[PDB]
Amino acid sequence: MRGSHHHHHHGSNNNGSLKSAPSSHYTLQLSSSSNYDNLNGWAKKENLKNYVVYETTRNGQPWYVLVSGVYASKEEAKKAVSTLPADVQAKNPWAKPLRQVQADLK
């Protein structure tokens, strides 16, 4: 409502826990939104097979993103899209390097 500006609280680096994970792995996105209850509807609607709802980060605004396992690299990731239907492809699955979500994980 009034003010809205969170001061620094990260921008770290020295941890070594970074390279301690396979970044070569990628993970696209089926869709996006800002409501768990409402989401449950879609996720259940399209009948997303093999998936797990969890919390994460997305533009200083937590959201329940859905992803299917993990694609070896970006080579199979691109094609992976074709497999997905229109409804999912209509959301233009913007590439999301698994190295990103590394934020919540630590």
Curated annotation (Swiss-Prot):
GO cellular component, one term: cell division site
The SPOR domain, residue ranges: 20-97
Cell inner membrane keyword on record: yes
An annotated Gene Ontology molecular function: enzyme activator activity
GO biological process annotation, one example: cytokinetic process
Keyword Ion transport: no
Reported consequences of knocking out the gene: Deletion mutant shows no obvious phenotype, but absence of the protein aggravates the division defect in ftsN or dedD mutants.
Function statement: Non-essential cell division protein.
General remark: Overexpression induces cell filamentation.
UniProt subunit comment: Interacts in vitro with multiple Fts proteins, including FtsQ and FtsN.
Protein name listed in UniProt: Cell division protein DamX
Lineage: Bacteria, Pseudomonadati, Pseudomonadota, Gammaproteobacteria, Enterobacterales
Name of the gene encoding the protein in the UniProt record: damX
